[PDB]
Amino acid sequence: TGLLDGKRILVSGIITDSSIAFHIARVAQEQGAQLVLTGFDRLRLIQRITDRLPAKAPLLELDVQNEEHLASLAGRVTEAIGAGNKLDGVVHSIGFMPQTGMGINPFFDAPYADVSKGIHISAYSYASMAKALLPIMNPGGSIVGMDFDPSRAMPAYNWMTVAKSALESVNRFVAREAGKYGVRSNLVAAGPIRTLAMSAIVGGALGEEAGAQIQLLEEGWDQRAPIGWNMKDATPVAKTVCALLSDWLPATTGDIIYADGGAHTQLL
């Protein structure tokens, strides 16, 4: 028997087969969960991607900045799962920052208008999704969001670090709301993952020093992690997410779970 047998789970922000969301999806189904997937904007591409998943599952459209999408969602989900049916889990794997708040671009020259859009999509949306979907969520349910450890600062990550810092604060407040419905809210702080965009950056595309800064990070991370860190293997992150969506961490809300091979616990 699977781990999430007959749980119903919403899963956001799939865009490629290297997206973490995709691997969460994959493992989720492997355990036997019925999924509902949202996508943003290029629904047509995302449709092609989601077809490679163990089982097919409904694709709804959701731009977290679109107010109506948020409004209409609560229903659109219940539609695709059948009325008198509730969700046992939502997964937030959304994030965005303009290239002024990330990469080689100096920290100071990011115009607030840029930064804000970032925080809107990367941290605010977490409460948005939780507001939309809490109503239709079963007791013992789970909310899970994607996070990169922002408690220290580092090169390149710039304003996104702030967005992540924001996000960990939002999460603790959602935890409060979620509690009313008997729902948990947590974040998975993950080590770096070799996604499409990340490898592109390791090839002039975000700069030259940028490629060198990514590489430095990735390598220190593996060296610090007492059980190592394979940037290419996104499975153990997904596995972790699924453990939070399971019934096996029932006493753990408002919190951060570290899938980083233990890096953040080691100085050198």
Ligand SMILES: NC(=O)c1ccc[n+]([C@@H]2O[C@H](COP(=O)([O-])OP(=O)(O)OC[C@H]3O[C@@H](n4cnc5c(N)ncnc54)[C@H](O)[C@@H]3O)[C@@H](O)[C@H]2O)c1
């Ligand atoms: N990249 C990493 O190594 C890493 C590490 C830890 C945490 N994270 C976090 O995990 C999440 C996903 O990372 P990823 O590597 O899968 O990147 P990704 O680009 O594959 O996923 C981000 C998703 O957000 C979606 N998105 C963008 N703007 C949106 C909007 N306005 N409304 C709704 N959706 C929108 C995109 O369609 C995309 O599918 C992000 O929250 C990211 O910060 C990433």
Ligand SMILES: CC1(C)CCC(Cc2cc(O)c(-c3ccccc3)c(=O)[nH]2)CC1
């Ligand atoms: C610190 C460093 C130079 C920059 C990125 C990090 C990890 C990381 C987190 C992160 O949230 C993202 C991200 C940003 C926007 C949209 C989707 C994903 C990322 O690409 N990489 C790995 C290296």
